Amino acid sequence: PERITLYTAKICPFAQRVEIALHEAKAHHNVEQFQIDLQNKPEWYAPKVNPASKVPAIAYGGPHVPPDQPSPESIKLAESLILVEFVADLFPHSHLLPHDPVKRAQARFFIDGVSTKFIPAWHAFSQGKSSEEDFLTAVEHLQALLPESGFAVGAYSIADVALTPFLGRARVTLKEDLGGYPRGEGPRVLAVLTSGTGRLARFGKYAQDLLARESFQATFDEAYITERYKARFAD
Amino acid sequence: PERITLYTAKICPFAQRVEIALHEAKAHHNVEQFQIDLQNKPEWYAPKVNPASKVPAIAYGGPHVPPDQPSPESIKLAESLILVEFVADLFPHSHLLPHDPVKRAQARFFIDGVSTKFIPAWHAFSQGKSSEEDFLTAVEHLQALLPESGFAVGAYSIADVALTPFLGRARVTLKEDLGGYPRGEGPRVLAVLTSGTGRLARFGKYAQDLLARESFQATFDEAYITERYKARFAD
Ligand SMILES: N[C@@H](CCC(=O)N[C@@H](CS)C(=O)NCC(=O)O)C(=O)O
Ligand SMILES: N[C@@H](CCC(=O)N[C@@H](CS)C(=O)NCC(=O)O)C(=O)O
Ligand SMILES: Oc1cc(O)cc(/C=C/c2ccc(O)cc2O)c1
Ligand SMILES: Oc1cc(O)cc(/C=C/c2ccc(O)cc2O)c1
């Protein structure tokens, strides 16, 4: 494939989707990463890379240039789920996209549940807006799609890429009591989510497997995330 | 491919996406359609086909059975955008999915704008919730992605499938003054959208081309839609 520059940020789970995808394709050492400071974005980022002014975004092809001077001739691409499929399409030996048309649809349907159920329910609960039960129910939607063993469609896929960055950050929030509830309530909900027992037993096992995946650990600065999350809660 | 039963409804633009996709693949005469009455859904639909109780949904493979007695052995698939990619994946000579990985990402990015900008802005404006300007701005987002000529990525694609059912219904709403504004305001906004002149000139030409597409006209019961839309407004 042509040259890839990835504009990302350690804090952002949507960006980590693309870092995981690249690592699964064993291409993480072929791509140039540029870290965007989301509190002080470069003035050239929105006009020259991504008018939405968000990470992730990729610059594809074109000449060799410094990443803070992206070329007009590279193709600019945004939206994390689209970029994960692009990486899958460019590096087929990653095996991120299943060959079988039914398994592809089932992987993408799982992603739809991550998008429309897990993430909004996690955001609402972690922000103190909604109930614990609203979050757990959304998790049960995903659990019910899981096969008896393995990842979301058996073999690891784009489905697992989409979810994992949000799971790993939810763990930090809950482990550290940053979820807006009294001390100890965070850790109890974490245990429900990941113990492997109880109402979310099957999801718990799956969660253990997602967080053990090499690509996740390699793209996840737990110390940095935990520090940012404590500071944010402190306000 | 194996046998396809499509559970659909004439009124539903999300379902029409899948009918268009099948017709572009020139497979509309190979699939069994079953019309779901959304005001009186069959008691077996949610438990046996789609627990979300929405159209579209596909039953794939399994034995030959009456469509009101779907088999446990067929694979049940839902979500219109996923089903459009499934149809593309099953009938490659449809040319719905571009070969080139960049063009695929650009087609899917256009779909993201249809999903996150056009449809919500159309819903809010047609329901009397928001301003005309909020709707037109969202249309301009899509316009800015269009190439100098052709469809969303040049050759017709899944991008055009995603948008067209909503455009054709918006036309009926606006042509017939069903948008919650005084007589004549609907038709004026239609002219902005589709005249080919003015602030939305390029989109207007594109809109003419989408509504002339054979697959759209063949899957669009304009008389039925117009009758349902007048009755709904009458309440
Ligand atoms: N829908 C986008 C969302 C990405 C997104 O929200 N990124 C955040 C950080 S995690 C961002 O860059 N925010 C910057 C801003 O809103 O100014 C995707 O999936 O790529
Ligand atoms: N996200 C779904 C939405 C489909 C949808 O909303 N279908 C409507 C009709 S246009 C439906 O079946 N509604 C039935 C109900 O909500 O009870 C998709 O794209 O497939
Ligand atoms: O410093 C900044 C600036 C900014 O604009 C966004 C962010 C973080 C966004 C984010 C984090 C977690 C998540 O689940 C979803 C998110 O969008 C951090
Ligand atoms: O009789 C029924 C029952 C029901 O549950 C939904 C519908 C229509 C839904 C619909 C139409 C247009 C659109 O832009 C979006 C929509 O979801 C009609």
TrEMBL record, chains A, B:
Glutathione binds at C12, K41, K54, V55, S80. One of its GO terms (cellular component) is cytoplasm. InterPro entries: Glutathione-S-Trfase_C_sf, Glutathione_S-Trfase, Glutathione_S-Trfase_N, GST_Omega/HSP26, Thioredoxin-like_sf. Residues 2-95 form the GST N-terminal domain. This is GST N-terminal domain-containing protein. It comes from Trametes versicolor (strain FP-101664).
